């Protein structure tokens, strides 16, 4: 047979975050996930007044906190947006 599995790179996967209401409602088996507490107003003002490097402004449905790309993700975006080979060590 074929085990009817899922590959690690399948185009369909859970969690589809969107442009930053809070979707902290439930989970599998119909249990309510605890809503993470809203961040401190001082910290929220700091983030809003100073955008972090690679500030996407996208929030995952599970938590209200924004999702920001890491250094390697900023590196891949730089290569992709500047139209070069997205692999640093691959002889073209």
């Amino acid at each position: 047979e074929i085990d009817a599995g899922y590959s690690s790179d399948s185009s369909t996967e859970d969690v589809a975050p969107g442009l930053y209401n809070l979707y902290i409602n439930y989970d599998i088996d119909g249990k309510k996930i605890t809503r993470p507490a809203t961040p401190a107003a001082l910290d929220s003002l700091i983030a809003s007044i100073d955008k972090d490097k690679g500030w996407t402004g996208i929030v995952d449905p599970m938590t209200g906190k924004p999702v920001n790309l890491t250094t390697e993700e900023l590196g891949l975006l730089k290569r992709l947006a500047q139209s070069e080979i997205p692999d640093e060590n691959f002889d073209p």
Binding site: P17, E73, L77, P86
Partner: protein, 97 residues
């Protein structure tokens, strides 16, 4: 080394990586195209300047990235108390006249 996302094209791309809508592995594979293999390493300025002006792939653009860029471009003093009250007032009194 850093990078400043100011082009809406990059923001549509940056949104896709973060929002996980488009898989990262698929994005890497989609980056091996006719334009990525047209390398720009060491070319003279008189050549590159026209190449960017002309031979620039036009990637698709999403309204969400447009809003996010406007949010980034929104300065701290873009709309303070005066620029929201008297600037609204001058338009209002103009319409009245």
């Amino acid at each position: 080394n850093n990078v400043e996302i100011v082009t809406a094209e990059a923001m549509t791309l940056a949104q896709d990586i973060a929002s996980r809508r488009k898989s990262k592995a698929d994005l890497i594979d989609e980056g091996y195209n006719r334009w990525s293999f047209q390398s720009k390493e060491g070319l003279p300025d008189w050549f590159l300047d026209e190449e960017t002006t002309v031979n620039k792939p036009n990637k698709p653009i999403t309204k969400e990235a447009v809003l996010a860029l406007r949010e980034k471009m929104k300065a701290l003093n873009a709309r303070p108390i005066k620029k929201v009250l008297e600037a609204q007032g001058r338009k209002k009194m103009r319409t009245i006249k």
